[PDB]
Every structure is written in C-alpha cells, then in structure tokens.
Design an enzyme around this catalytic site. Structure first.
Site, PDB file in Angstrom:
ATOM      1  N   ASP A   1      37.177  39.634  63.690  1.00  0.00           N
ATOM      2  CA  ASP A   1      37.651  38.377  63.123  1.00  0.00           C
ATOM      3  C   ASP A   1      38.897  38.586  62.273  1.00  0.00           C
ATOM      4  O   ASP A   1      39.710  37.667  62.128  1.00  0.00           O
ATOM      5  CB  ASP A   1      36.545  37.723  62.296  1.00  0.00           C
ATOM      6  CG  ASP A   1      35.318  37.390  63.122  1.00  0.00           C
ATOM      7  OD1 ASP A   1      35.345  37.611  64.351  1.00  0.00           O
ATOM      8  OD2 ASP A   1      34.324  36.907  62.541  1.00  0.00           O
TER       9      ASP A   1
ATOM     10  N   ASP B   1      28.612  36.080  61.385  1.00  0.00           N
ATOM     11  CA  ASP B   1      29.552  35.203  62.070  1.00  0.00           C
ATOM     12  C   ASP B   1      28.803  34.190  62.927  1.00  0.00           C
ATOM     13  O   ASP B   1      27.780  34.507  63.539  1.00  0.00           O
ATOM     14  CB  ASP B   1      30.506  36.026  62.937  1.00  0.00           C
ATOM     15  CG  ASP B   1      31.693  35.220  63.430  1.00  0.00           C
ATOM     16  OD1 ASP B   1      31.959  34.137  62.863  1.00  0.00           O
ATOM     17  OD2 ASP B   1      32.360  35.667  64.386  1.00  0.00           O
TER      18      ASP B   1
ATOM     19  N   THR C   1      33.972  29.985  63.253  1.00  0.00           N
ATOM     20  CA  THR C   1      32.828  29.734  64.123  1.00  0.00           C
ATOM     21  C   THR C   1      31.619  29.242  63.338  1.00  0.00           C
ATOM     22  O   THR C   1      30.767  28.540  63.893  1.00  0.00           O
ATOM     23  CB  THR C   1      32.471  30.998  64.903  1.00  0.00           C
ATOM     24  OG1 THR C   1      32.117  32.042  63.987  1.00  0.00           O
ATOM     25  CG2 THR C   1      33.651  31.451  65.745  1.00  0.00           C
ATOM     26  N   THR C   2      31.523  29.600  62.057  1.00  0.00           N
ATOM     27  CA  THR C   2      30.447  29.086  61.219  1.00  0.00           C
ATOM     28  C   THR C   2      30.752  27.675  60.733  1.00  0.00           C
ATOM     29  O   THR C   2      29.867  26.811  60.727  1.00  0.00           O
ATOM     30  CB  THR C   2      30.213  30.024  60.033  1.00  0.00           C
ATOM     31  OG1 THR C   2      30.067  31.368  60.506  1.00  0.00           O
ATOM     32  CG2 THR C   2      28.957  29.629  59.271  1.00  0.00           C
TER      33      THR C   2
END
Ligand code: ADP
Ligand code: ADP
Ligand code: ADP
Ligand code: MG
Ligand code: MG
Ligand code: MG
Lengths: 31, 49, 523, 535, 523
Positions: D399, D68, D101-102
């Site tokens: 997540d 992540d 988030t990536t």
C-alpha cells in the site's frame, strides 16, 4: 490534551441495536 | 432485523391476488349448477358416502 | 454480524469473545510450557492417538508447540513465534513463550481498568525501547585474551545444558559442545557436527570423536585399514551411466557386435577407474552407488571404495580432510586430495563404522551419543542442538549478558525508571511491561520449589541500588553474583526473547475481530 | 394459490419453485441495508491509526492477521450477494489505487444507512440514487481546490516520505515509521519511467524471510534469489562479478524431437565418449573466453560440469525461476543468452558484492547484491519475528508502494485525517440550497454520510464523535477552511498541514466515485431470486 | 480417582480442575451482574426458550440468579447467597455477589504465587474482623430529634431507588416509600403494604392511597357507599355448612319432612345473619364465599357483603380499621368493630375497586402502581419491595452508614492499616482483601463511564488522612462529602454485604475436590 479516554469493550452496544431493529419491524408491520 | 414471528408473513399484492383465486376456486365449482341448464355434482366422502 | 448472520458455516466474534478467546488460548500455551522453564523444570512426553505415534520427549518449547496442533487461532501466533526462535538463535523458545503469555496476562488485567488497547501498544513500544538499552549497556564484549573467551564459552554451554536432560553431565557435555564449535574455525554451518545416536551405554560414555565416522563399509575384497593414505572423494556415476544422450540406441545387424559394444562399455568404465588411481590414492568415496564392475577394479589395486555415503556426507569429508569433490577425473594436477592417518573400522553398538582417525585440517566433528533408551537419545540430540547453535553465534557475536534472572531484572528496572517520567495514560501499561519481565525469574524460582515471592523481591531491591550483576542462584536458593558463579547467556539470544515477544504480543492485542472461515471435511 | 390453480390443476411455472425464495415487498430494500451495515460496522473499528486489526482464519487452518480492507473482505465465506458486492468494491479500490480499501466500505455503508430513513419518507430509491450523483459531483469539484506537490525525485523526497507515512501509519509498521517509509519511496523512483509516468510493480520484488527484526528490513538494489551452488566448495563472495546469464542446461545438446540415435560399431561408441568430453570442455571455455566469473542457469547442472566450474574458478547457481533471472539482467545490465555459442563480453552483467547470507540455523542462503550500476530493479527484504508480521508487512508496504505510484500519475494531494471529508460535506450542504427543489433531502443524506468517516476516527481514538466533529466543522465556516482534521495523540493542534497528514487526490476521488456507483447498483434492485437449500 | 476410575457415570477432579471450575463459574456470575451495580447501571431482561416464557426484567441481583439456573456447582453457592440477602435485608444482593466474586478473583491471583489456601482463609478472618470495626465505629445513630430521622429515612429510600428503574421519580416514589413504613407505626410485617399493579398511565401517576383498596365488589342488590359505617369482618361459613359432624344424614320416611328440614336449614342460616346485624354494622367482609341465601338477607337490611376477599385480605382490613376477625357471633359486647368514613367504589384502569376512605387506626397501606407495560410494573414492584424492606429495618435499627462508595473505602482502610502490622505470610492475603473492597466503588464509577482509575485513587488518598465521610459523587463525576449530599445506607445492609461475602468465599476457596454424582434422565 484529550482529557481522558473511556474504552468500552463489552457486549451490550450490539444488543441495543437489536432491540431497535426489532421494534422497527413491529412499527412497519402495522404501518 | 425483520419480524421474529414463528409463522409466515406475506404482504403486498401477493395476498391481494391469492384471495381472488381463493374466491374463483369456489365460483368455478358452482358455475356449472346455475339455472335451468345447470347440472348436479357428486360429493364422495372418504368413508364411501 | 452475529445479528442477521450472512455466513454459511462460518462464525465470528467482535470485541467480546475475540479478546476472550485470544487471552485464553495464549495463556494456556504459556502455562503449558511454564513447567519446563529453568534449571529445575520438568519435561514433557508427547504422544499421539495411535497409528505410529512415535513418542518424542522434548524440553525445548519449540518442539512442544510444533507437534501439539492447537486449534485456537491466536495460539498459532505464539507457536510460530517459537519456531523462528529455534531457527534464528536456537535457544529461548521456552522463554519467549512465557514472556509473550505474561504480557497478554497483564493485558487481560487491563480489560477491567478500561484502558484503550492502542494505548497499551504505544506504552509497550516505549517500554521495549527502554529494555533494548538495558541489555546493550550491560553486554560484556570479548576481543583478545582468548583464555577468558574460552572460559566464557563454557558458561554459555553450562547455562543452556542446565535446563535440559543433561543435568549431572556438565563436566563432560560442556567440553563436547565447546570443542565441537572450536574445531570449526570458521562459519557456523551447523552441519559439519554430525551427531550419531547409538543405543547401549550411559550418557557419560558419550564422547567427541577426534576424526570422523561413516557407514556403508569398505567393499567386499578391499583392505579395511590403510596407514598414511590420500583420501579422494567423488560425486560421479560409476556403472550403468547412460551418458547424457537421451535418444541413443545400439542398432546393430548381428549379435557378435553386441558383444563388442558391451566389451567397449566395460573398457570405458575400466579407463575411468584408471584415471582415478593416477592421483595416487588409497581411499575412494562416491556419493552415488558403486556397482560390481568398478568395485573389482578398486579391490585389485588395493584401493578402498565407500559407496553411497550421503548427499551431505561428502561435504563433511571435504571439510575434515581438506580436499575437493572432484566429480571429473581428467586433470590430476588440479585435484586436491585429503589427508588421514588411520581408516580403521570401529564397532560402536554392534555396528561397524569407518573411523577416519588422524585427519588433517579437520573442520568437522562427530558426536557419538550413547543413551539408555531411544527417548533419551532423541532428547540429548535436541539438547546438544540447542547448545551448539548458541556457541556458533557466540563466536560471531561475542557480546554476552548475565543470565539466570539477572538480565530480566535489568530490563525491568529500565522500564520502571521511565514509567515514572510519563503521564498516567501510558504509565500503567509500562508498569505491566515491567511486571511481566519480573515473571521470568519468578517461573525459574518457583519451579525449583523456592520462595518465589521473596527472591524476586530481593532481586528488585538489589537492582534498584547498584548490583548490575546480581541474579538468582538456583544451586543453594539465594541471591548471588552472576559474574562469580558464571551464569551468562548470549546477547542475541536474550534480545530475540525480548524483541519477538514484544512483537507477537503487539499482534494479538490489536485483534478485535476473529472471523474464522468454514473448514473443509469437518462435519 | 401457489402450486395449484383455481380449476384444480397443478400450477408450476419454474422448476423447483417450492424451494425458492422471492422477496419484492418493502423489505427487499431493507434486507440490503441491514446486510451492508453489518459489513460497514465491522470495518469501522479498523479505520485510522488507532484501528484494531482482524484475525482471519482460512479453510486450511492458516491464520493471517490483516488490517487492510482488501484482504479482509476477500478471505470471508459470506454467501450473501449484497455483501459480495462489498467484497468487489474493496477489491476495485485495491486494483486501481490501493489505499482506501477500508474507507470505501464504511462510506458505502454510510450512504445506505442515510438512505434508510429517506426510504421511509416515501422517496423513490432511484430518486435517492439520482440525488447522490448530483451530490458526489460537488464532492469531486471541491476536492480539487487545494492541491500541490513539489516532488522532483532528486532531493525533494520530503513530500514523498510524509505521503507514505499516512498510509503506513495505520498498519503495524509504526515501529519502523521512519525507516520503512523511506524504503517505499526509493523503491518506486528507481524503477519508474518518469517520461511516461508509468510504474511497473514487476521490477519491485517483495521477498520475506523469518528471523531478525523489523528494523533489519533493507532496500537491496538488485535481486534476492535462493542460491543453489552445486559445489559445496564454491566461493561464497565475489567482489567484481562479470555475470554470464544463460538459459541452456550444462549438458550435451538434446533436441526437441525424437531422434533414436543409432550406434553400429565400436568406433561410433568411442565417438560418443569424445563427443561429450569435448562438449563439457567447450561449454566451460566459451564462458572463460568472455571474461566471466559468475554464471546463472535456469535449468539443472550435470555432475561432470560441476567440477569443471571449480577448476576454472567459475561459481554458478542452479535452478533459478522464470521471472527471477529476468530481474537479474535488468539489475546487472546484462542480456539473457539462449545458447553457449552466442556468449560475448557485451552480453555480460555487472555487479559488485555477490554473496550468500545464512540466516541463523536454516539452509536458505539468499543472494545479496550490494553494489550495482544504474539498476532499474530493486528488491525489498522484509524480516520479522514471525510469519504473521511479515505477510502483513508485505501487504502494508504494498500500500505504500501504491501511493507513490499515484503521485506520478497525478501530482495533486489532499489532507487526510478526516479533513477532506468535513470540507466536502460543507460543499454539498451549500449547494443543497441552490436549489432545494426535489433532491434537497438526498444531498443532505450525502453530507451526513460523508461525516461518518471522520467521526469513526474520533470513535477509535477514544474521543466523542459528535463533540469533536462539531468543533472541527464549525472552525471551517467561521474562517477560510484549513486542513483541519483529528489524530490519535492529536500532536497538539488539529492542523493537518502541520501534522503532515498527506493523502493523494485520486485516492479520495475514487473513494467517493466507487462508493456512489456501488450504492446505485444496490438501491436499484427490487427483487431477490435466490434458491433454498444446497441440495 | 481419575486413574482406574471406580465410578459408573460420575466424574470428579482434585486440585487441578476443582479450583479452576470454581473460579471460572463464580467470576462469570459476578461479571454477569457487574453491569447492574450502581445508580447508572443497566438492567437485564430474562427470557426462556418457550412454553410460557414469562419475561421478567429485574435489576436486583437476587431475582437474576434465582431464575438463570446455573449448571456450575460452585456458582450455586453465590446464587443461594443472594437469596438469603433478599430474605434478610432485601438489598445488597447485587453488591454481595460482586464482592464475593472479587474475593475469588483475587484468590485466583494467589494461585501462581503458591500461597497456601488455608493462609488465605486465616488472613481473611483477621481482615473481616478489622472490617467490622470500621462500619461499627462509623455508624450514625438516631434516637430523639425525629425531624432529622425522617430526613435520614428519605436518604435511605433515595439511595435504594437510585439503582433501579425509578430513576427520575425520586420526587414522588421516595414519599411513597417513607410514608408507607411510617404509617405502619410498629413491626415491619411487610404484608400490610399491598401493592396493586394496574396498566395505563405513567409511573408519576402512581400514588399511595390514604385508605385501602379491595376487589370482589359489593353484592348484587346492596348499597355501594355508606357514610360513617362500622366495618365488621368474618372468617365463617355462610351457606352449605355441613357443620362438623362427619357421618350425619337426614333419614326420614316421607318427602314432606325434607321440606321441613330444608326450611329449618334456611331458618338457622337466617338466624346466623340476624346475630351479625345485632352489632349495628353496615359492611360485612367474609374470607369464605357468600352464597345467594345470606346475600339476600344482607341486601334487605341495607348491609354490604364483600365475599371472598383473600386469606391475607382480612388481616390487612383488621390492621387498617382497628377491629378483629370475629369468626363466631355469640357475644356482641366482646366483638370490636372497625371504623371508616367512605366505602365508595373507585375505578382504576377500567376496574371498580372498593375504596375504604377515611379509616381509623390505619396501620396498612395500598400502593397503586401504574406503568406503561407489565414489564415496568413487575420491575417497579420489586424496586419498591427492595425499598420498603430496608426502611422496615431502619426503624428497628437506626444505625446508618455513608454509602456511595464511602463505606467500602472505610472498610478497606482498616484492613490496610492492619496489613502492615502482620508477618509476610498472611499480609499478602489481607492486601487482596482490601483490593476487593475497593472494587465496589470501582464498579459503580465505571458503570457511569467515569475514570475509575482516578476516582478510586482519589478516594484512597482522601480516606488515608481524615475524610471519614468522603465518597463518590455520581451526579457530576467527582469526589464529594456523603453527609452533605445525603447518600446513606443502613448498617445492617452493609454488614450483611461484608459478612455473607466473606463466609461464602471461605467455602469455595476451601474446596479442593468436586465429586459430582451421576445425574438422572440426562443422556
Ligand atoms: N545455572 C543457572 N542459573 C540461573 N538460571 C539459569 C541457569 N541455567 C539456566 N537458567 C535459566 O533457565 C532458562 C532456560 O530457558 P530455555 O527454556 O532454555 O529458553 P529457550 O526455550 O528459549 O531456549 C534461561 O532463561 C536461564 O535464565
Ligand atoms: N496522523 C493521522 N491523523 C489523523 N488521521 C489519520 C492519520 N493517519 C491516518 N489517518 C486516517 O486514517 C485513515 C486510514 O484509512 P485506510 O484504512 O488506510 O484506507 P484504505 O483501507 O483505503 O487504505 C485515513 O483515511 C486517514 O484519514
Ligand atoms: N446516590 C448515590 N450515590 C453514590 N452511590 C450510590 C447512590 N445510590 C446507590 N449507590 C450505590 O449503588 C449500589 C447499589 O447496590 P445494589 O445493586 O442495590 O445492591 P443489592 O443488590 O445488594 O441491593 C450501592 O452499593 C450504593 O453504594
Ligand atoms: Mg536454553
Ligand atoms: Mg492506510
Ligand atoms: Mg440497593
């Protein structure tokens, strides 16, 4: 189908960007 | 990325302001020795002359 | 990120030295403990640079990796993998380390073949699913007919102790390991089998005690042996109680009242011991320390007093005598006492130990390990701990598979049969999974000095057409039947070797970037 | 000149100006792009289901393999103030939504790479930043075109499972791709307040223990704590537990102030013995009068109180944490009682199978709560083969717990796999000609940077980026634009509606909004005043 | 020898780190130049740390290894192996480095199989003997019918220049390389082809001169062009002779006699020039320097004077004009003069060179290399040198084999056919020899980006049943016939790739102890 997959896990993909970024600094110096 | 020269590079208005202060460093010396009201200077060397 | 590096003292690598340092650091871990796998593998001696080095020889792969302290980042995954294998099943920590290293060695062969690393992960997930069905369909269950289950338990302890220092002691140490778990008659707590290591004598002089051994000998002026006694243990304070009222002083007006208080303190300590002897006992075990004032009261009444055995010493005495802890003495009709026959003191290695001979409901054992050096006793304790933990789970899961290379060729056959029913993108990764499963009988065969190139080739030809019980015979150096020789392992041990090595090799193969931070106090 | 005047005087403006660094030039904007592109090129290989993980080593030597984008940039030692803003960008996506988030770092590095060629053409950096705001507004309005969900939290959990499979498909939990996806769906709906559309993550306890496998991860409806039975002969299984939750230690009552209790005669010392003997019989009888057969205590036990538990057949645990007993009173429906005198039958909790489970050869013996009655607190027990696969599964399933929370906040979805980025890139290109007055080049640089995220999925899947993206983008113009993306094994056709690649609307809505505002704060900067050496 | 070490600063290793450092240091050499093999491989740029670094880009494997300076002891064997390959045949220095490294990479796979290293040596000697018969039986000779031999020579230069920087210049540089050796009409001296590198212009602007080019332009007051001239060269001293009598002075009594001696010195120097012009010449080339006194004599007679061309420059003028050196002028009837048509001066890159246009018996050439940078001119000179040396040996040995991966599959097929007719001790070493020969078409196929797992598998199935001319087609990425496409190499080049790699891998595999001595001035 995908008709193959060519995994390229090696060095010179990053060194090829080093020659590009170094030559861009020369062209911007005498711009 | 940047230039890989082993020296020093300064662009822009930095050298454009340094050359004026380099010329004003010489002019402010010889401004006191101009005209009939000008006065002489002293040039002392390291050897004592 | 190497070009125009924005780090202070930290370095990193991406897809060039990331998989290079991961494959070097993981193979060198597996090649380290490669020589300790099998019934003919040698052992290692672990030493430090100094400052109480405390040398500890171990053959088990978990104890080797937990003390070396590898600086490689990817090698710590295989170190932590063998730590869980010792904590869950207690065996196969060396077998899961070589198998996880042979998968990444075959994955290093797929570097020059330009195979995508996500294809190897998807190829190994289908290979692991085919290998679970090979062990599940070949597991031998044991329900009733207990004379075949006790014979099956001796094959489990005979296979585990063959790869340790107890090589020519299988006629004795197998009976010390089977009967220790057989006397539990319940859950595998793995703490009722208290192992006592004493110097002097050979390993053949070791034995399983029929009762229980203890330290902290019986008082000063108390009897040393009482026949047909009632054992009562305790976990209460005897003297200098300061009973649970913080902020209480003795505020008197004269020193004559202090002599009345300290006589009233000793009367309440005497009345507490008088509540203990109303049960009609002859022995007393306290977890806390017993001072001089209650010690004289037990000696005058002819009652033993064992002071400060252990925190877990009263738990083993409660399981070997059939009583309770009984930290409060106010109801003698609700306190169950222990039972014994002899509480005589025996001398083992010039040390007097309290022998609880002839106990009733003895769900606890005491293994008296005797060895030539301290290095042998530290190795034989871990060798017995690797044997008692499997038998504590074999009584919970009676499924057993044929070990000695027979289980690995059954798993490698199911992968190779499904590798031919797949397209060529994932079939090459499945063939590398089957070749790493055949390396585990190859390490065992080559450690003895046999022809490993031909014996595994004879195992692959045998398992290709029948012969589901054919394995490697390390006694003569040939191929024999594993059901006849009696070389079996547990199903949950062999499953955790396959499953944890497939999950740990999945993590390291998916790493393309190793970004290590700047360490502290390293300059 | 520097550090000297034209009259010979020393020219000192600020302190330690000789060891300073100042860049205004034309390379001050160039140094921000080359520092941000190297972060985006690092996170490009960890995007999509074929994204490879990264191995992170801490300062203490601990190694954590993370995928992540929030934990990767946070555990770096990057002393670069431009790349430090990319760390807070991935942290802001994790705190608000927690799924992209990536992708929010690759998108921010794509907007700066397209602005590098626009900077050489003479465009002002604020004019590019003002052009990105007019271009990101088109991407927000076009993303709200096709969006529908039929979640009712009763039986239509099929859109909820397929939404969590998109989040868990890129992690290392693809072996449990169907099992662990159903865990995160049922863990949210049992604790969420549907009347307020608010989900509290304090009710979802995420615990982990080494041993077993990834398939042994179960959703325990209740609580899982470390059981600490003070008596070793305590019964390890309660069939019907009347749980008496208390916060008072099993001891005589000690006040909070300084007392210094005075003892004068021997009648007062004999009164001390009868005071404590009747106090331990009062604290035990007041639990048995309520009908309780299980006790929970925050503080420690006395040795005298331990044997009174066994005589009255009252199992009890010892030294439970702060928020751990707060989860017991919600899962069992009981009340936390301060004293022993306030105990009653109404403040007792109800539970079914209360037992401890030993894991292999360890001595943990965690609590397992099987049966309950309308609990609002669940506990996920993650097992694995090592601590690397458990701490990642704690980050992977978190997540998955966040994307179900975003569906209760907003019940509108999109289709991922690069399908929404290609469709949003066509909306900016259509509005770049209406009108191409000043910001024509700034909007086309936004549409060329939105295509970096689907072409990064084609690079990680072994395909060609410019070959696959030209085929998918042309099919959305010749007809009405469907949910058309890509995949790794490609699942036959490229229809994301048939492959069930479902992402949240507000997840991708905050990916374009946060990456545009972070680009505006790193384009509107023309000076760096960093110091030199450390000391 | 490690235990109780009797050395001062020298270290050693025996059978543990000896073969470990030998296999690591040799694979890292072969994996370095792995990316430069084939017609689609990239090039390297070699740089130093400073102090006149003199960057020199090379794709040929000999020039890479001769300048890197490897510190590994076993890697210097493969470095010296590529130096001999450049000195003998001038091609295949990259192919012999990867092939010798792939043999030791397969020998590293035989470490864990417990194969004796002398069995691998004896297994490879039988494998190399069978591989010589595959190239000898497949060699295509060319005697008469010279219109097919000149087409065969362009296939040799087309294959050599395809793996270099001259990629899209095969329509021009093939004719510059074939016709250069074809104008020799004799022995391959490899020095009559003088390559002149001048900046300015593209590589397509380069050409082969019909005459000859030179420097050190024609005098001061001498004619610049003479039509239908007779060229006479020389290797004698013109002025300040000091003629061969060491210890001879002019001891006179007055200064008037010194004026008569120095006039007698200039009369003998004038009489030497008068003996030169009796041949009836118009041009004069001296290897030594011509001073001012004979320069005025040649200018007054209308004769050219080229002073101090080169030591090897008078040898090329003797081969392009058909004369002799003629260092002594005392017999005009025994001195053969050259022949030419135009001695005009041409300007190439703002430099006036002397063009010897229309010379008779011109067994010498001049390649005027023109490039964008000096890095291209240094690479195209070594690329042309690797192309002219093979054609200089193809005219001496007309045997040619089909390259492009076709020759390696023929060599690997003859080893695999005899690997099945051997016992199992040496058969495993012969199978590793055949797998290393198949790596050479695998490196070529993977450098372009093709599927190397399938193309070499199709080449193995094609050569197993007929198809002796089937090879790898790098143009479209499939399997084609090498006789139709015209991809051929010389027999002596492919034999030295096979033979020198098998001899160099024999030395490194037989090393069990590396005892390195204490170096000097290294602390
Ligand atoms: N009598 C025997 N015959 C054949 N193989 C045996 C015998 N005894 C032990 N082995 C093999 O030796 C191996 C020892 O593995 P071990 O190092 O104990 O693994 P771990 O470290 O995980 O406990 C086992 O895999 C088993 O197959
Ligand atoms: N089955 C699939 N087919 C195509 N694309 C997928 C599939 N599953 C996931 N993806 C893509 O992989 C990407 C993963 O993004 P991710 O790294 O999880 O973002 P974040 O870092 O914000 O969580 C998503 O943008 C999604 O489009
Ligand atoms: N047109 C072509 N088709 C197929 N293969 C080719 C072609 N041109 C060159 N090759 C291959 O490329 C390789 C280049 O090897 P090279 O690096 O020149 O070896 P060396 O360094 O020893 O001269 C040769 O082995 C040859 O088989
Ligand atoms: Mg074992
Ligand atoms: Mg995700
Ligand atoms: Mg060549």
């Amino acid at each position: 189908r995908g008709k193959g997959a060519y995994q390229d896990r090696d060095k010179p993909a990053q060194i090829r960007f080093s020659n590009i970024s170094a030559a861009k600094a020369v062209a911007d110096a005498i711009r | 990325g940047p230039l890989s020269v082993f020296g020093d590079r300064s662009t822009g208005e930095t050298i454009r302001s340094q050359n004026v202060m380099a010329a004003a460093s010489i002019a402010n010396i010889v401004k006191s020795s101009l005209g009939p009201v000008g006065l002489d200077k002293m040039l002392v060397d390291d050897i004592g002359d | 990120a190497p070009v125009n590096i924005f780090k202070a003292g930290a370095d990193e690598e991406r897809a060039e030295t990331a998989r290079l340092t991961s494959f070097i650091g993981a193979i060198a871990i597996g090649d380290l403990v490669k020589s300790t796998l099998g019934p003919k593998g040698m052992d290692k001696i672990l030493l430090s640079s100094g400052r109480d080095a405390s040398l500890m020889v171990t053959n088990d792969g978990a104890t080797i990796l937990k003390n070396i302290g590898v600086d490689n980042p990817a090698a710590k995954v295989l170190v932590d993998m063998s730590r869980v294998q010792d904590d869950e099943v207690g065996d196969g920590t060396t077998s899961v380390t070589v198998l996880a290293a042979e998968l990444l060695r075959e994955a290093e062969s797929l570097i020059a073949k330009k195979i995508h690393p996500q294809t190897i992960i998807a190829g190994w997930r289908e290979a692991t699913k085919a290998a679970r069905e090979a062990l599940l369909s070949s597991a031998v269950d044991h329900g009733s007919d207990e004379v075949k289950f006790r014979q099956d338990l001796m094959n489990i302890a005979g296979t585990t102790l063959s790869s340790k220092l107890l090589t020519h002691h299988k006629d004795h140490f197998t009976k010390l390991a089977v009967e220790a778990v057989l006397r539990l008659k319940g859950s595998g707590n793995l703490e009722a089998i208290h192992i006592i290591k004493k110097l002097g004598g050979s390993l053949a002089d070791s034995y399983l005690d029929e009762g229980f051994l203890l330290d902290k000998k019986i008082g000063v002026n108390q009897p040393k042996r009482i026949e047909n006694a009632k054992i009562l243990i305790a976990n209460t304070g005897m003297d200098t109680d300061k009973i649970k009222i913080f902020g209480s002083r003795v505020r008197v007006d004269s020193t004559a009242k202090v002599a009345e208080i300290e006589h009233a303190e000793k009367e309440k300590m005497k009345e507490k011991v008088e509540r203990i002897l109303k049960h009609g006992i002859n022995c007393f075990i306290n977890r806390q320390l017993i001072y001089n004032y209650p010690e004289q009261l037990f000696g005058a009444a002819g009652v033993m007093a064992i002071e400060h055995a252990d925190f877990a010493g009263v738990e083993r005495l409660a399981l070997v005598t059939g009583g309770e802890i009984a930290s409060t003495f106010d109801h003698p009709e609700l306190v169950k006492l222990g039972s014994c026959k002899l509480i005589e003191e025996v001398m083992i290695g010039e040390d007097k130990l309290i022998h609880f001979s002839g106990v009733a409901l003895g769900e606890a054992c005491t293994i008296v390990l005797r060895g030539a050096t301290q290095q042998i006793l530290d190795e034989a304790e871990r060798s017995l701990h690797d044997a008692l933990c499997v038998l504590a789970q074999t009584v919970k899961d009676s499924r057993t598979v044929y070990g000695g290379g027979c289980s690995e060729m059954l798993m490698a056959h199911a992968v190779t049969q499904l590798a031919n029913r797949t397209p060529g993108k994932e079939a090459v990764a499945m063939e590398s999974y089957a070749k790493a499963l055949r390396m585990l009988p190859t390490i065992i065969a080559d450690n003895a000095g046999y022809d490993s190139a031909d014996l595994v080739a004879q195992l692959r030809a045998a398992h290709s057409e029948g012969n589901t019980t054919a394995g490697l015979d390390m006694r003569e150096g040939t191929i024999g039947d594993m059901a006849i020789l009696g070389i079996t392992e547990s199903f949950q041990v062999k499953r955790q070797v396959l499953l944890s090595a497939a999950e740990a090799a999945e993590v390291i193969l998916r790493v393309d970037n190793i970004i290590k931070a700047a360490p502290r106090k390293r300059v | 000149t520097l550090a000297f005047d034209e009259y010979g005087r020393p020219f000192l403006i600020i302190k330690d100006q000789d060891r300073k660094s100042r860049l205004m030039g034309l390379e001050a904007l160039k140094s921000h792009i080359m520092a941000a592109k190297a972060v985006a090129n690092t996170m490009r290989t960890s995007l999509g289901p074929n994204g490879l993980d990264k191995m992170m080593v801490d300062k203490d030597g601990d190694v954590t393999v993370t995928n992540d984008g929030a934990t990767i940039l946070s555990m770096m030692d990057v002393d670069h103030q431009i790349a430090k803003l990319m760390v807070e960008l991935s942290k802001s996506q994790d705190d608000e939504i927690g799924d992209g988030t990536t992708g929010v770092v690759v998108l921010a590095g794509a907007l700066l790479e397209e602005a590098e060629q626009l900077l050489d053409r003479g465009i002002h950096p604020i004019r590019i930043a003002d052009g990105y705001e007019q271009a990101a507004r088109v991407a927000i309005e076009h993303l709200d075109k096709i969006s529908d969900s039929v979640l009712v939290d009763i039986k239509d959990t099929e859109p909820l499972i397929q939404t969590a499979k998109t989040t868990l498909g890129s992690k290392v939990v693809n072996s449990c791709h169907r099992q662990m996806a159903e865990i995160a769906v049922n863990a949210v709906l049992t604790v969420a307040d549907m009347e307020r559309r608010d989900v509290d993550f304090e009710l979802i306890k995420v615990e982990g223990k080494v041993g077993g496998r990834l398939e042994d991860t179960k959703l325990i409806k209740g609580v899982i704590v470390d059981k600490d039975f003070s008596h070793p002969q305590m019964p390890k299984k309660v069939e019907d537990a009347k749980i008496a939750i208390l916060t008072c230690p099993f001891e005589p009552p000690k006040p909070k102030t300084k007392h210094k209790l005075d003892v004068t005669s021997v009648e007062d010392y004999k009164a001390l013995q009868k005071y404590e003997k009747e106090k331990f019989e009062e604290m035990i009888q007041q639990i048995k009068e309520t009908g309780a057969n299980l006790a929970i205590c925050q503080w420690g036990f006395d040795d005298e109180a331990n044997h009174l538990l066994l005589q009255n057949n009252l199992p009890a645990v010892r030294w439970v944490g702060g928020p751990e007993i707060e989860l017991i009173a919600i899962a069992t429906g009981g009340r936390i009682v301060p004293r022993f005198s306030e105990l009653t039958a109404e403040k007792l909790g109800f539970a079914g199978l209360v037992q401890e489970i030993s894991f292999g050869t360890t001595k943990d013996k965690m609590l397992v709560i099987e049966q309950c009655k309308n609990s609002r607190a669940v506990t996920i027990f993650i097992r694995g083969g090592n601590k690397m696969i458990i701490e990642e599964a704690k980050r992977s399933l978190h997540d998955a717990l966040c994307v179900i929370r975003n569906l209760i906040r907003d019940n509108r979805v999109v289709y991922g796999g690069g399908a929404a980025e290609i469709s949003c890139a066509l909306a900016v290109s259509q509005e770049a000609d209406k009108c191409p007055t000043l910001e024509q080049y700034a909007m086309r640089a936004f549409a060329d940077a939105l295509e970096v995220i689907p072409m990064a999925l084609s690079e990680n899947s072994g395909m060609n980026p410019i070959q696959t993206m030209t085929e998918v983008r042309a099919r959305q113009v010749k007809e009405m634009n469907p949910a058309l993306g890509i995949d790794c094994l490609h699942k036959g056709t490229n229809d994301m509606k048939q492959q069930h690649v479902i992402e949240t609307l507000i997840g991708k809505k905050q990916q374009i909004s946060l990456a545009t505002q972070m680009v505006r704060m790193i384009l509107k900067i023309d000076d760096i005043r960093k110091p030199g050496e450390s000391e």
